[PDB]
Design a protein around this ligand. Structure first.
Ligand SMILES: *C/C=C(C)/C=C/C=C(C)/C=C/C1=C(C)CCCC1(C)C
Ligand SMILES: CCCCCCCC/C=C\CCCCCCCC(=O)O
Length: 271
C-alpha cells in the first residue's frame, strides 16, 4: 500500500503532521494557481511582440494550459489521498482513496519539456547550427530524460539502487540538454543588442538553476542518509516545495524573460 512512492510510504507508516499535510497542500495549490495567472498573462501580452516571435508566446500559453490542468489534478490527488486519524492526530494513506500518484507531474514534464526547449528557437536566431538539428536533439534527449526518470521513479521505495541508477541515466540526458542550450544561447547572443544579450544571460542562469532543481527534489529524501532528517515527511515537504519553485521558474519566469527578449529584438528597435 505504501509501495508506489515515498509519499505513500511515509503516509502509510508515520503519517503526516497537520503542518506537513497542510503545507504541501498549500504549495501545490499555489503552483496551479500561478499557472492559470500565467496563462492569462501570456494570452494578453501576445500583441506586445512582433508576429515572427509569437510562436514563443503560443508555446508559453499551451505550457500554462497543461501545467494548470495537471498540477491542479496533482493538488487534488494529494488532499484526497490522505485522511486524518483522530486517535493519533496525523494524516494517513487512505485505502479508499486512489493513493498519491507521481503520474500527473511526470506527464506534465513529458508534455512541457519539449515545448520549453522549442520556444527559445522562435525568439533567438541560431548562427552555425541547424534549427532542425537543435530541435531534434532537444526533443529526443528531453523525451529520454523524463522517460528514464519515470522508470527510476517506480523503484524509489522497493529498489533504491534502481532508483538512482535510472536517475543517473536520466541525468546523462539532462547534461546533454544543458550542453545544447549553452550553444543555443551563445549563438543567440551574436549580433543582437547588448540589452538582448543581457536578458539572454539571465535566461541561461534561470534555465541552469531551475532545471537543476528537478533532480534536486528527486534526490531530496536521501540527501541526509538512510536515517537522516530528510528521510521523513520533511523530505516530502521540501521535495514538493522545490518542484513547485522549479515549475514556476522554468515555465512562467522563463516565458516572461523570452517575451521581454522578443520585445528587445523588435522591428522598430532597429535603426
Ligand atoms: C516544467 C517542467 C520541467 C521543466 C521539468 C523538468 C524536469 C527535469 C529536468 C527532470 C530531471 C531529472 C533528472 C535529471 C534526474 C532524476 C530524474 C528527473 C526526471 C527528476
Ligand atoms: C516584464 C514585467 C512584467 C512581469 C509580468 C509578470 C507575469 C505574471 C504572471 C503570474 C504570476 C502571478
Amino acid at each position: 500500500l505504501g509501495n508506489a512512492n515515498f509519499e505513500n510510504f511515509i503516509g502509510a507508516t508515520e503519517g503526516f503532521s497537520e503542518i506537513a499535510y497542510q503545507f504541501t497542500s498549500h504549495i501545490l495549490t499555489l503552483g496551479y494557481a500561478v499557472m492559470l495567472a500565467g496563462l492569462l498573462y501570456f494570452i494578453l501580452t501576445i500583441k506586445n511582440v512582433d508576429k515572427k516571435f509569437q510562436m514563443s508566446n503560443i508555446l508559453s500559453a499551451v505550457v500554462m494550459v497543461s501545467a494548470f490542468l495537471l498540477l491542479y489534478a496533482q493538488a487534488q490527488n494529494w488532499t484526497s489521498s490522505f485522511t486524518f486519524n483522530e486517535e493519533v492526530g496525523r494524516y494517513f494513506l487512505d485505502p479508499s482513496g486512489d493513493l498519491f500518484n507521481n503520474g500527473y507531474r511526470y506527464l506534465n514534464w513529458l508534455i512541457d519539456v519539449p515545448m520549453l526547449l522549442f520556444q527559445i528557437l522562435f525568439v533567438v536566431s541560431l548562427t552555425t547550427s541547424k534549427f532542425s538539428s537543435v530541435r531534434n536533439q532537444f526533443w529526443f534527449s528531453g523525451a529520454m530524460m523524463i522517460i528514464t526518470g519515470y522508470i527510476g521513479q517506480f523503484y524509489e521505495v522497493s529498489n533504491l539502487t534502481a532508483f538512482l541508477v535510472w536517475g543517473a541515466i536520466s541525468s546523462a540526458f539532462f547534461f546533454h540538454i544543458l550542453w545544447v542550450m549553452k550553444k543555443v544561447i551563445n549563438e543567440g547572443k551574436e549580433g543582437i543588442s547588448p540589452a538582448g544579450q543581457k536578458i539572454l544571460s539571465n535566461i541561461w542562469i534561470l534555465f541552469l538553476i531551475s532545471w537543476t532543481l528537478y533532480p534536486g527534489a528527486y534526490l531530496m529524501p536521501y540527501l541526509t542518509g538512510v536515517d537522516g532528517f530528510l528521510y521523513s515527511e520533511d523530505g516530502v515537504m521540501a521535495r514538493q516545495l522545490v518542484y513547485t519553485i522549479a515549475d514556476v521558474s522554468s515555465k512562467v519566469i522563463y516565458g516572461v524573460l523570452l517575451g521581454n527578449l522578443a520585445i528587445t529584438l523588435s522591428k522598430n528597435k532597429e535603426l
